[PDB]
Design a binder for this molecule. Sequence first.
Ligand code: HEM
Ligand SMILES: [C-]#N
Length: 127
Amino acid sequence: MKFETINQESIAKLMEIFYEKVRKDKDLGPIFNNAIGTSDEEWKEHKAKIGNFWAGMLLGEGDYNGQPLKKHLDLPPFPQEFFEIWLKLFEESLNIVYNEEMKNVILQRAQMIASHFQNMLYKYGGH
Ligand code: HEM
Ligand SMILES: [C-]#N
């Protein structure tokens, strides 16, 4: 009932579950909607792309070829606190799809990226 492995099937289930939580989210939903659209197909094309990102990260295969940091830099600014929401929802989704062992491998990878995005996107300083 829970994946003890990482494959196209498990990642596709992860994308389904996570981006449905994101779409329904009070804080994240508008950001994503303003960026990709509201149609089911636009959301399917986004899940496909992020699915390819994760396959490249986790399986070493797929057609993801974009610049993830640049993309988030180019987004209209949003609060740093949203990274907490994103991670909470992602961990919930992983907990549905994967056993504890696999879940923790992928969460760790997401945490590392989120931490890198945050150090790059917010000074936390002043100027
Ligand atoms: C506050 C948290 C985050 C928000 C609000 C957010 C938002 C978005 C949005 C709106 C897009 C669509 C970009 C567009 O169509 O212009 C996007 C793309 C993407 N996101 Fe995020 N993101 C967040 C965190 C993350 C994290 C932590 C990761 C990785 C672990 C990630 C991975 C990606 C990737 C790979 C893309 C595709 C970029 C491309 O088109 O090449 N995001 N994100
Ligand atoms: C970005 N999800």
